[PDB]
From a paper:
Here we present a concise structural study on how the activity of SHP2 phosphatase is controlled by an asymmetric, dual phosphorylation of its substrates.
Two of them represent substrates modulated by a phosphorylated +4 position: the 15 aa long pY632-pS636 peptide from human IRS1 (ppIRS1) and the 16 aa long pY191-pT195 peptide from human CD28 (ppCD28); The third peptide, the 13aa long pS892-pY896 (ppSRev-IRS1, shortened Rev-IRS1 peptide) from human IRS1 represents a reverse orientation, modulated by a −4 phosphorylation site. A highly similar RSRLLHSDYMNMTPRR motif has also been described in the T-cell costimulatory receptor CD28, where it plays a crucial role in T-cell activation, proliferation, and immune regulation. While the phosphotyrosine was tightly locked to a single position in both the ppIRS1 and ppCD28 models, the phosphoserine remained flexible, and was to be located at a broad loop region defined by Arg362, Lys364 and Lys366 in the best models.
Residue numbers in the entry:
A (entry chain B): 189 to 193
B (entry chain A): 4 to 282
């Protein structure tokens, strides 16, 4: 759901 | 120091995202985004025409045109996009066809550490597959140390005289974490990408993708932009990494995600310069 990288 | 201050200053200016991203937020487009918070700016998004009339929203893909300069031709531009989802494979090929793209840069494996970064959107070697209205033949694969080249031929099912070759440069060795410790592989790869693209007249923008379409995607694109400036204006021309990142960030938010990617960009440019001086 959220782009950590 | 120096790189951290430069990268942190860039990250400052993006703490407010100013340009509108309303289309990506529409209920119909929710499951066309891999990540809820990574969305294309409306004004540079790739608008998909000629969609199925029965689909109420058929014009959306999580992708933006990136121009290196304000008057850039389509041939000198890029499309930054996310890796295909299971339900956007057909939209991806509609985009490639409509924009007349002839070169695709894939910066990830299909799966990394058990997580999908890109659903396979190409047939096996010598096989043919239909993706919605588009037909794709995989004509040949060539393995290199760091990448595989897939020579694909894309056409619209039924319609004659719509076939064109699309060259998929699939970078295979990018590490699961961090960045490569040496830019040699990426530079040789981008050299093949560029010579392929320049050899096709009336080619559309080069498509570049990663899991979100911003991190690895921005790193590859910015390196390609900078070495092409050096190609055109020589090794003592002035290079402004921050301003170039600012330029691409004004067209898709968040391009170049980590300070390691930032340092990798500088290293790649310095290596490219060194390669031309050192024969």
């Amino acid at each position: 759901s959220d782009y950590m990288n | 120091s120096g790189f951290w201050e430069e990268f942190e200053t860039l990250q400052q200016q993006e703490c407010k995202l100013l340009y509108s991203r309303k289309e990506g937020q529409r209920q119909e487009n929710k499951n066309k985004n891999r990540y809820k918070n990574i969305l294309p700016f409306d004004h540079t998004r790739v608008v998909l025409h000629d969609g199925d009339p029965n689909e109420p929203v058929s014009d959306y893909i999580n992708a933006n045109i990136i121009m290196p300069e304000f008057g850039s031709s389509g041939k000198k531009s890029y499309i930054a996009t996310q890796g295909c989802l299971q339900n956007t494979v057909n939209d991806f090929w509609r985009m490639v066809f409509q924009e007349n793209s002839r070169v695709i840069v894939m910066t990830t494996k299909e799966v990394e550490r058990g997580k999908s970064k890109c659903v396979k959107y190409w047939p096996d070697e010598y096989a043919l597959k239909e993706y919605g209205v588009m037909r794709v033949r995989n004509v040949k694969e060539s393995a290199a140390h760091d990448y595989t080249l897939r020579e694909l031929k894309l056409s619209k099912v039924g319609q004659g005289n719509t076939e064109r070759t699309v060259w998929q440069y699939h970078f295979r060795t990018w590490p699961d974490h961090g960045v490569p410790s040496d830019p040699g592989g990426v530079l040789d790869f981008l050299e093949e990408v560029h010579h392929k693209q320049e050899s096709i007249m009336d080619a559309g923008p080069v498509v570049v993708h990663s899991s979100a379409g911003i991190g690895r995607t921005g790193t590859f694109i910015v390196i390609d932009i900078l070495i092409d400036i050096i190609r055109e204006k020589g090794v003592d021309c002035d290079i402004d990494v921050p301003k170039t990142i600012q330029m691409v960030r004004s067209q898709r938010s968040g391009m170049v995600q980590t300070e390691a990617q930032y340092r990798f960009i500088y290293m790649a440019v310095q290596h490219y310069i060194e390669t031309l001086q050192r024969r």
